[PDB]
Amino acid sequence: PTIQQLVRKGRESFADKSKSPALNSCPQRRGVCVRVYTTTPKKPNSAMRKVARVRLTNSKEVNAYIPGEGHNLQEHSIVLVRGGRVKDLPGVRYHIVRGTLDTAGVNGRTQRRSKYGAKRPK
Amino acid sequence: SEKRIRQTNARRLHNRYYARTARNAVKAFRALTDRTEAEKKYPVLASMLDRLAGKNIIHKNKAANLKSKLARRINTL
Amino acid sequence: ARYTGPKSKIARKFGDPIFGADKVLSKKNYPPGQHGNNRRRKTSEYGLQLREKQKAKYTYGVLEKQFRHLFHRAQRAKGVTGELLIQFLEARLDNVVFRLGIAPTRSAARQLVSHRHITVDGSVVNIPSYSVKPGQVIGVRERSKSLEVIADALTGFNHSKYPWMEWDQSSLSGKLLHMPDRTDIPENIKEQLIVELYSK
């Protein structure tokens, strides 16, 4: 544009959006599991992923992926939800923090223990 | 705590009495017509206003304003 | 913190016996682990820069945060960045003690400094990272001038040939003349690689 055009109007800047908006800028949130179900990945991936419908304290519905081998989650279980989205799964943009509140650590883990909330073996 | 309440109330009554007296005197003087009579009652009212300003019920500038206005009126009858 | 691990592993990994002279470096010139001496896979230029940085760090007993701060100091200072970095590394109190020969190894010098057997300008200084300036006097503490280890280390060190260090055996002390040039410093560290790695 011309200098006169920019004087008249100017430039416009647009703020970005959060990748995980249901956290409300909190690093984690507390929630209650509505339904703990199993889902299918996209076309090039075949598995049975474990997902949970979680009602956060700020009255928001989220789909949170439960990581690790096996879980003890059921309905009406208090869990901690953090950010992070799985690629093949569509609409699942949150993770359950293992080893906190109701959800326990992954049993039998020896490597990457801190990512799955597993205590150091004796 | 009641000491402050009592002192404030006593001082409020004390200030109100003298302030009302001065205001009534000013109002009565403002309605006079006889020049000689006005000149005879001007000094006492000036004394009252100046004593009030000294006692700090009113401000010295306020007393000066009132005295100036009343002297101007007494000049113009 | 300190490395306090095995030393022959690092010596064999880097080839050069940076921790002095050892009998293990012969008949074993491979990096540790079961995958050693299996040819030599092509390591990238970044890998070479990283290995040079690690060689300097293991040589002088400096951890990564302190090393980065030393690089920042060299960058702020006036002169060649790499030469200044090597001068700052050699100006540490434990390195100065080791060059004076009071202790056999740099780790021994650090242990003596930490355990307060070294005095700087007549006062006890026990910080191994203390930066020695030219004109200062570093000597054995008077209460520990008859230590068996110190006496053994000084036995046979009658040379004291370092040009930038003046040794006085009568006072059991030494002084630093000036900051030596990088070519005078006897270390095989290529400071240029560390400089580009830390600046890129």
Binding site: - | - | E142, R143, S144, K145, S146, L147
Partner: protein, 118 residues
Amino acid sequence: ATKIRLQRHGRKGYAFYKIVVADSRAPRDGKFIERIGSYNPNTNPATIDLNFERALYWIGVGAQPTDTARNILSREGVLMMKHLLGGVKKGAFDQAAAENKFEAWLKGKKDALNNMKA
């Protein structure tokens, strides 16, 4: 009223004071009209830096010093009536010569012998 006092400005365990001229209602380390010196009580000689002319001017216009500020001013020699003399002139107090009084008191040094003959 206007005052001469010290603001604590060092760190924990090491107090350093800034000698300022401030209104009495101001916060201790807050607003100040002017800065006239500094005070380090950690050193045994009790280090003092002061602007003599400005301190004398503030005393003249009537700033009231605190106890320690008054002691500092007396030590520096601001508190004098040499200017108050109405019957004399050029009355050189020369008390700075006696106020020098250099206290070069040191401590003897002793050493422990190392009898490690083994």
